[PDB]
Swiss-Prot record, chains A, B:
Record organism: Homo sapiens (Human)
Tissues where this protein is expressed: Preferentially expressed in a range of tumor tissues including colon, lung, liver, breast, prostate, stomach, uterine endometrium and cervical cancers with higher levels in tumors than in adjacent non-tumor tissue (at protein level).
Protein name (Swiss-Prot/TrEMBL): Regulation of nuclear pre-mRNA domain-containing protein 1B
Job description of the protein: Interacts with phosphorylated C-terminal heptapeptide repeat domain (CTD) of the largest RNA polymerase II subunit POLR2A, and participates in dephosphorylation of the CTD by RPAP2. Transcriptional regulator which enhances expression of CCND1. Promotes binding of RNA polymerase II to the CCDN1 promoter and to the termination region before the poly-A site but decreases its binding after the poly-A site. Prevents RNA polymerase II from reading through the 3' end termination site and may allow it to be recruited back to the promoter through promotion of the formation of a chromatin loop.
Family under the similarity heading: Belongs to the UPF0400 (RTT103) family.
Source domain of life: Eukaryota
Length: 133, 133
């Protein structure tokens, strides 16, 4: 049901497998030769044989980064949903808290009253005939 | 491991199973006859024997209400602690949110620089000799 405790737990648990693939591809990008991102390095290629391999390297870095940016974008959208979920839920919990407090004060009233009948009954139990005699 | 997603999941699950015993003891208290809580009913007792049966009844209503109020006061302290956890956690999540936003924006920056190298490379390759005669 929404937006209940189980909902929140499931959404909380899908943050675990939001890491996973993270730091590895993150290290592939973390590296990446400087030649694939600095255009000013291009003047140093004086060989078509070398220039064509930078071309292929560059191509696949382009694919790595595009895919990763897609995953990151999705994770951020998920985090915003999880945020709204948390906020709605803490907001509901404050209500539940207020009502439970009231219920408890109602049961303390009931306990007081029962306690009162108890005390006065101890008095009232004498003052009556023990008709066995 | 505090505090921390794992922490919150555990505290979250210990909320479902605090309502377990609820509705039955809650229902026994609900049906507590008026004779054990109204001191004004005591004068309708004109027989020591009926007053003593009442005395016993009253007594066990007293234990039912005291133990239930103890569990309830405890539940309320746990909910207040969960409140504090939920709130600390939504703040740390807003932090993580901002850092992930900046991180991604930096990876889109890197994507653009790579993109620029791709184009200038497509131009710069026909500027070199295909040595083959």
């Amino acid at each position: 049901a929404m937006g209940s405790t189980e909902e929140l737990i499931k959404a909380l648990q899908d943050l675990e497998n939001a890491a996973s693939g993270d730091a590895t591809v993150r290290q592939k990008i973390a590296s990446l030769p400087q030649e694939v991102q600095d255009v000013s390095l291009l003047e140093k290629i004086t060989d078509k044989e070398a220039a064509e391999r930078l071309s292929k390297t560059v191509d696949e870095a382009c694919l790595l980064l595009a895919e990763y940016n897609g995953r990151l974008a999705a994770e951020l959208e998920d985090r915003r949903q999880l945020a709204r979920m948390l906020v709605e839920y803490t907001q509901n919990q404050k209500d539940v808290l207020s009502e439970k407090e009231k219920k408890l004060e109602e049961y303390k009233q009931k306990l007081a009253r029962v306690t009162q009948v108890r005390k006065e009954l101890k008095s009232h139990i004498q003052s009556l005939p023990d008709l066995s005699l």
